[PDB]
Structures are given as C-alpha cells and as structure tokens.
Design a binder for these strands. Structure first.
Ligand SMILES: [Mn+2]
Ligand SMILES: [Mn+2]
Ligand SMILES: [Mn+2]
Ligand SMILES: [Mn+2]
Ligand SMILES: [Mn+2]
Ligand SMILES: [Mn+2]
Ligand SMILES: [Mn+2]
Ligand SMILES: [Mn+2]
Ligand SMILES: [Mn+2]
Ligand SMILES: [Mn+2]
Ligand SMILES: [Mn+2]
Ligand SMILES: [Mn+2]
Ligand SMILES: [Mn+2]
Ligand SMILES: [Mn+2]
Ligand SMILES: [Mn+2]
Ligand SMILES: [Mn+2]
Lengths: 97, 110, 85, 93, 96, 108, 79, 97
DNA sequence: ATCAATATCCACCTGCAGATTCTACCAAAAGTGTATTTGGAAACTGCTCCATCAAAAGGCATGTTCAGCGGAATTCCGCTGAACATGCCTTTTGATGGAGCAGTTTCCAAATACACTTTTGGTAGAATCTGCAGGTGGATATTGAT
DNA sequence: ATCAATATCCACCTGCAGATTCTACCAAAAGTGTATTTGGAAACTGCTCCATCAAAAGGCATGTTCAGCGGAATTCCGCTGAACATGCCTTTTGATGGAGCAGTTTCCAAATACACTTTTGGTAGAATCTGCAGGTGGATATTGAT
C-alpha cells in the first residue's frame, strides 16, 4: 500500500490553495448563515446578490489573514500546530475585543 | 482643447475638478489643484497597471485579472503599504510556506 | 416531518475551515480550532451585517446592496475592492 | 448613467502595453483604487486647508496632501507628474 | 484673538450633578478634545450618509444613524434617546 | 419680544447655535437641517456628562475631589463602552490600569 | 549617540508599567530601535504640517495632527 | 546582610509604576533625540514645548502598550522573560512593518 | 514557627500652585423678522433581478481505522539577568534677550456665476474577433519503502 | 544508492464566455466669455515663550555575587493527518412571479440670504479660598534567614 508521511499531503494542500483564489466556504451554507445573522436585526430582508459575495470575500480574506497570524503564534511557542490558544493571542494582538 | 489635453493628461481633469467641488472639501477649489490631482491619479493608475501586467506577463497570460493585481501589490514595498488595509476580491495570497513547516534535515548536494 | 431545516453556523464545515488555514499556511490544525474559528467568523459577520444593515434601514430600502456591505466594511478599516465604491 | 474611470484606465494601459488586456473585475478594482486614493488626498487636502484657515484647496494643498498620504518613491514621482502637468497647463498660457 | 471651547459647559454639566467635585486643567483640555473628537466622528459619518443617498442635507435622521454607527450598544441607546428628547422638547416652538 | 436660547428650548446647556455654526462651516454638506444641531448637541452633552460622572467616581473612590487625567483614564478603561469608543485614543497622563499576569506572581 | 540617551533604566521602567517582570539583554537596543522608528514616522508627518503652515517652529498641534492621521489620537494638548 | 530574592523588587517596581503616570524618559535626552531626528527633515527647526510634550507622552504610551503585548508574547512561549523575538512577534501581529 | 530588616499604611497637619467668587467690558455670537429660493418627501410606475421550486448529478462532507510523530510532562545544568552599594556627570531648575509666531489692514489676482454653445464619454445593440479554462498525454519530478 | 507509486509539468487542443470592434442617438458634461464677489499673500511689529546658560540636585553607570529561568535532552502517549468508502446536499440551469429599487415630475415646507437687535461666554486680573502633594512618625503587612 502507499502512504504519504503525515504532513506531506498537507503541504501539498498549502501549496495548492495559495496558488488559487476561489472562495473556500460552500456558497449556500454561507448565504444561510448571513441570512440567519441578519434576521436578528431586520426581518424580511432581501439581499442583493453581490452583497453576499462582498460579504464572503470579506470574511474569507479575514480568516486567512487571521490564520497566518495564528500560525506565527504557533511557530513561536516552538510548535507547528495551531492551537485554540494561538487564535486567542493572534486576535489579541491585532487588537480585537 | 480640453484641460486634460492642455496638461498632457489622459485622465479627466474636467471631471476631477467637478468631483472636488460637489465633494465638500473646501469652500473654494484652486484652479490648478484639479490638474495637479488628475496627474497624481493618472500616475498611480499607470504604476499599478505596469506592475499588474508584469505579473500577468510572468504567468504567461495577456489579460490582467485580480490575482495579478493582488500579486503586483503585495510584492511592491510602495503599493503594499498604500494598500495595507484594502482587500482585493479574488486576489489570493502571496505564496509563502514558513521554514519550520518544511521537511527534512540537510539533503542537498555537496 | 416534511417541513424541517436548521440554523446555520455548523454550515461552516471542518473541511472548509481547514482549507482557509491551508491558504494561510497552517499545516497542523488542533481540533479545538474549528468551533473556535466558527466563533470568530460569526461575530465578524455579525459586526459587519449590523452596520451594513443600519445602512439599508437608512436608505429606507429592504434590500441589502453591495455598496451596503462595502461602506460597512470601509467604516471599520477593512476596505474592499471589486464590488463598487 | 453612473460614471467611472474605466475608459481612461484602459487608454493609460494600452499606451504603454497595447497588447495587455484588463479583465472585467480587474477594471472594477482599479476604479475603486482611483476613487480610494482620490478620496484620501482630497480629504487630507481639505484638512490641510481647514487646519490653516484657508477657504481654498490649491494645488499646494494637493501636494502636501500627496506627501502625507503616499510612500516615498510614489510620493516623489507623484509630486513631479503633479508639478509637470500644472506647469504645462499654464504653458498653454 | 478669541478662542472658544466647551469648557464652561463641560464644567456646568459637571457641577449640575456633582457640586463638590472639580476638574484639573489637563482634564478639561482632555474632555474638550473628547467632545471635538466625537463631534467630528458623528458629523463626518453623517456627511457620508447624506452623500451616499444623493441628499444635499444633514437632517436629524443623519445625526441619528451616525450616532447609531459611531457609539457602542447601551451608549448608542442612551445617546439617541437624549437626542430625540432634546429635539421633541424643541419642537415646542410655541410658548413652553 | 422676550426670548430664550435654542439650547434653552431643548433643555440643553451645551451651545446649540454653536454646534449649528460649526456644522455649517465645517464642510460636511450643503444643508444643515434645523433639528440636526439640536440632536447632535444633545448627544454630546450626554457623553460629556457620561465621561464626567464616571471620571468623577474614579476620583471620589480615591477620596479626592478634583478630577485629574488619571481618573479619566481609569474611568475610560474600566467602562466597557467608553473603553471601546476610545480604544485608539491615548490620554496624556493617564497611566495604565494596574494588572500583573498570573504567571508572574507566586499565588495570592 | 542621543538615541543612546534613552537609558537602560527608562526602558526598564516603561517595561514595568508595561507589566514586564524579567527583561532579556537584547531588549534594550531593540526597544531603542522601535522608539526611533516611531518618532521618525510621527515627526516626518509632523514637520510636513510645519512646512505647509510655512513656519519654522513645530507646534504641539502639529504633532497632534500627525499622530491623528497615524491612528494614534491624543488628548491633552489641544485639537 | 539583607538581600531580596531575584525578582521581588521587580513586582514592587511593577506595582509601583502602574500606580503612577509620571513620564519615564528623562526629558533632555528625549528632547535631544527628537531634535536629532527632525534635523533629517528640516534644519534650524524650533520646537514648541508642548510639541515635545505631545511626542514623549505618545511615544511612551506606545512603548508601554507594546511592552504589555510583548509580555503576553513571552507568556505564550511559556517564558517570563521578554526577548527580542518577543517585541518582534508583538509588532508583526499589529501591522507595524 | 521566630525573629529582625523593610516595605506599606493611614490618620494628622500644612504651604503653594492654582482653583474660585467677583465685578465688567464687549467683539461676536445667537436671535429675529420678511423675502427669496429649492431639493426631498410623496405619488406614480417601468423593469431589473431577488426568492423560489425543480429534479438530475456528483463533487464533497462525514465517519471509522490506524499509527506516526508532535506536543507535554519532567530532569538537569550552564549562565544570564536581578539585586546592590557606590560617588560622578548629566539632567533639572530659574532667569532672559529676542527669534518668529500670531494679530490686523489691504487691494487685485483668482475664483464663483449664470447663460450659452461645443464636445465627449457612457448605453442598448449588432457583426464578430480571441484569450484561456478545461482535458488528455507522454516526459519529468518527488516520495518513501527497501 | 535503487525501484514503484504518484504527483506535477509542459505541449498541443478548442469550444465559449467575454473582450474588440464601429454606428450613432444624446443627455449630462465641459469649454467659453464677461460681469462681479472674495479670500490669500503681503507688509508691519506687538507679544509671547523658545533657545541658551549657569549651578545644585539626584539618577545613572558599574562591577560583583548568584538564584532560578531557559533551553537542551529525553521519554511517551494520544492526537490528528492520510487513506478510503458511503450517500447526502450543494451546485447548476432554467423558468417564472412579483417585490422593490430606481427614474421622473412636482410644489411647498423648510432652509438660505442679509439687516438689524439683544445676549453671552471669553478675558484681563485683583481678591482670595482650598485641595492635596509632600514630609512626619508609629501602627501594620510582607519578605527571607533559619
Ligand atoms: Mn494539489
Ligand atoms: Mn513585500
Ligand atoms: Mn516599486
Ligand atoms: Mn433636520
Ligand atoms: Mn457602560
Ligand atoms: Mn455667596
Ligand atoms: Mn424643494
Ligand atoms: Mn440522478
Ligand atoms: Mn503508538
Ligand atoms: Mn517527536
Ligand atoms: Mn522680528
Ligand atoms: Mn467620442
Ligand atoms: Mn490550463
Ligand atoms: Mn524552568
Ligand atoms: Mn456672562
Ligand atoms: Mn499624600
């Protein structure tokens, strides 16, 4: 049988996604979420199409921006695994609470 | 002859002058200001366009698309700073994989 | 029976989150990250939708436009290109 | 009948690299770019003026503006191009 | 040359509620910048609002939404309250 | 004949006419509605009293009667809403909230 | 060196107020680096306001506006 | 022969300094540097007193704020000593670049 | 658990930088009245495009196995910072000619205006050109067990 | 180092969305030429408050002693990535209804434009009341030698 040492396909993935630029969260599920979130403000709200996109491109940009920082908080603790505690610090330093 | 022409600019000096007026920035708007700005705005547009194409060029392509723009930007000390808190839709991220995440122990040639 | 659905933050699948961090260069993801990432993602959209809708309501409209999401983003320092403005 | 800088961007592009083409959305982004910076400068100009008890935003404000809102090399080249065109605008008497 | 601040006021408002409490020089300089700081904050978002809606005027509705955007939760609440009161109590544009 | 001030009308003690003056010449828009300055002034005086009260407590809590910057800081920083509204504002002479991380103390 | 004038103690103090307990040896010259790099970014902006206002002196409100456009708003000196 | 344990005067100093709000950099030194730095932008420049006051106040505020972030960085690495590598991450996760 | 050596507390009282009640003059607001002007809130409605249900279609999420290897608990040690007493040089303090910043009068170069008249850049559209995504293939790497 | 399984690369291919190319109706723009209102650069010097220096304060520089923190070395388990299979629901292509955004016209309430009248917060500043930083001495908590 063939087995790729752990962390090898992962790196295949990193190289992969940094080369492309398509959104990475499923469209509808996302739309759903937005809608849900919005409902809590104004009911019966119609969303222009692109408003979901500008919304999604936005969030994804952020989460990726945030992940890089998170990954730096990892390598810092002399590790290579992003832990819930990195995000805390990562967000804590970009200043977000 | 148009002010754009009367200045060597391809950008609408006329426009910019108006925008500035119906824009609420000052009571009055110096006559030369709109010129000076249209020039500054043209310059930048070209600067990025230059670096943008180059990215397309390097990728064997002829049509500048967002990744190119986003690449031109994140790789230019100047632009990446002027556009630090701006997000390019469909831009991607400069390819980069931290060393601590790479494989091995010295297996190069000697 | 026939008419049932659900609310959606779990709509942000573990595989997706994994992908984002992948593009962000993460190679090894500890399992507590996911619900964590979700937690964050929620309050981001929550923060942007709010301000963004405050705009629709002011326009007396009932249709969130994109320069709606956009001005909301700008307001907050996060500026977006590729949708107007 | 909304406006936009698309038309000139395209010219400016072709002038140097006539072969190069600019995608639909790439264009939309560029428009945003221009309006963005246009915005920053005008605003800074507007303040430079206000700070200094002036009712007019001259090319002098526009300049300092540029100096404040752009990085060295971009700022440098801008002030030139800026002066240039405004000097040539007065050359045309 | 004359220069005006919000000091007198800041001070009267302090004194209204808590009489045997004073305010240092810097403090007053700071509370003044705070007012101006926010004044602009608000008047500016308002400016953008109207602008955004091809409207050539700043009504109270603008100052409202602004206030709504600029200030945080419970504080945006109280502000708007205070805003709409002051105005209503102002439309008693008769005897009073 | 007789007459009060617009501030007087709105039950305000912050200058309504002034805020209206600044609003017009402040270059924000062509027109300034008649109620807008009244509304704005109301908000301002509000917040004005809001920091003031808090800043006062800060001071009194320490048996002092005169508010110094330290109080305003301590005030702003403990208030959630103010702390957020003024997060990117630094108060000249305000010091910082006392706080020593656990991993630096033995126990207590 | 004037930047050297920012004594090892001052760095130490700030770092105390900052909550730091134990300070490694390198921190000192590093902190100086940061500090200069900050002052520079601020004063460049500051002085630019000075030359525009065609003055020879650098007003307090010049620093203040500089600091403001950097997103570092300051209360206690006007503006 | 009295002597305090390594790190007991530290906290005494932490606690001592967080209670105060006195500027921590000697004024003349600072004053010089501010001037030394401005020289590179314009010569024969005069400085309002307060203009130098504004700078020190803000610069210090900034440095203090950064030291807190730095310390957090160190505690993340399960250390209690702020190293150069600390300030570095603290800044990287703040934008300063 | 027991002292010392010190640090910290706190009710107690006092001199000076600086707040306070005072009378007060006023350039400049803020207010007010009639006249002239208009930009938005309302009423009507053309058409763009947002919400849906539809039934096939498969790309993609989810669950379970398996173990490799990374993270965490733990031991030991070299050395790097904290603490400390010292006594000298650098910053702090109080006083001063005067370098420039604010204060004010000014007179046209420069910027609004309102009406026209010439020119240009967006728009629904129609004949048509074309850069590149989406696929396969054979050559050429890259991984990893052996 | 060698051999097998895989992923990646690189060249030729091509239907199709989206760019390239004129044609031309045009309404919102941009240019043009006085008539005419105005703010900015100018000339002067009244007036702070900036640079400069001497002299007693006090924080900093420094070398020594060594505790305990950090980083290396070590050991181990259980957490998460790789692989593979199952069938769920996301994605896709329309087709169709009508909710709302958006283009227009419209007229008057609400706002700008002075002239003129009343009111006020800013200020120089002598008279003077006072909060509190700062220096004292003794109760009271904390730290470390043993
Ligand atoms: Mn791949
Ligand atoms: Mn770069
Ligand atoms: Mn460059
Ligand atoms: Mn109004
Ligand atoms: Mn609160
Ligand atoms: Mn009395
Ligand atoms: Mn009207
Ligand atoms: Mn089927
Ligand atoms: Mn095992
Ligand atoms: Mn291991
Ligand atoms: Mn002179
Ligand atoms: Mn044309
Ligand atoms: Mn291809
Ligand atoms: Mn240890
Ligand atoms: Mn009075
Ligand atoms: Mn005391």
């Amino acid at each position: 049988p063939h087995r790729y040492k752990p962390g090898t396909v992962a790196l295949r993935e990193i190289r992969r996604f940094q080369k492309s630029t398509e959104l990475l969260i499923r469209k509808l599920p996302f739309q759903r979420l937005v809608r849900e979130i919005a409902q809590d403000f104004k009911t019966d709200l119609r969303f222009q199409s692109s408003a979901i996109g500008a919304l999604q491109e936005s969030v994804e940009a952020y989460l990726v921006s945030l992940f890089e920082d998170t990954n730096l908080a990892a390598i810092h603790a002399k590790r290579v695994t992003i832990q819930k505690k990195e995000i805390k610090l990562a967000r804590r330093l970009r200043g977000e609470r | 002859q148009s002010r754009s022409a009367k200045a060597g600019l391809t950008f609408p000096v006329g426009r910019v002058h108006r925008l500035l007026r119906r824009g609420n920035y000052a009571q009055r708007i110096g006559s030369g200001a709109p010129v000076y700005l249209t020039a500054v705005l043209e310059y930048l547009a070209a600067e990025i366009l230059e670096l943008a194409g180059n990215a397309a060029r390097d990728n064997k392509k002829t049509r500048i698309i967002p990744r190119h723009l986003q690449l031109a930007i994140r790789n230019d000390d100047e632009l990446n700073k002027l556009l630090g808190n701006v997000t390019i839709a469909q831009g991607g991220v400069l390819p980069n994989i931290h060393q601590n995440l790479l494989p091995k122990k010295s297996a190069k040639a000697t | 029976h026939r008419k049932i659905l659900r609310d959606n933050i779990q709509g942000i699948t573990k595989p997706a989150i994994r992908r984002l961090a992948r593009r962000g260069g993460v190679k090894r993801i500890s399992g507590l990250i996911y619900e964590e990432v979700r937690a964050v993602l929620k309050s981001f959209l929550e923060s942007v939708i709010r301000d963004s809708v405050t705009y629709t309501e002011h326009a007396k409209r009932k249709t969130v436009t994109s320069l709606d999401v956009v001005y909301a983003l700008k307001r907050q320092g996060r500026t977006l290109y590729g949708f107007g403005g | 009948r909304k406006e936009t800088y698309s038309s000139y961007i395209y010219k400016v592009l072709k002038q140097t690299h006539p072969d190069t083409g600019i995608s639909q959305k790439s264009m939309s982004i560029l428009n945003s770019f221009v309006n963005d910076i246009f915005e920053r400068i005008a605003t800074e100009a507007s303040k430079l003026a206000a700070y200094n008890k002036k009712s007019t935003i001259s090319a002098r404000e526009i300049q300092t503006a540029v100096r404040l809102i752009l990085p060295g090399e971009l700022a440098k080249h801008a002030v030139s191009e800026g002066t240039r065109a405004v000097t040539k605008y007065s050359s045309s008497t």
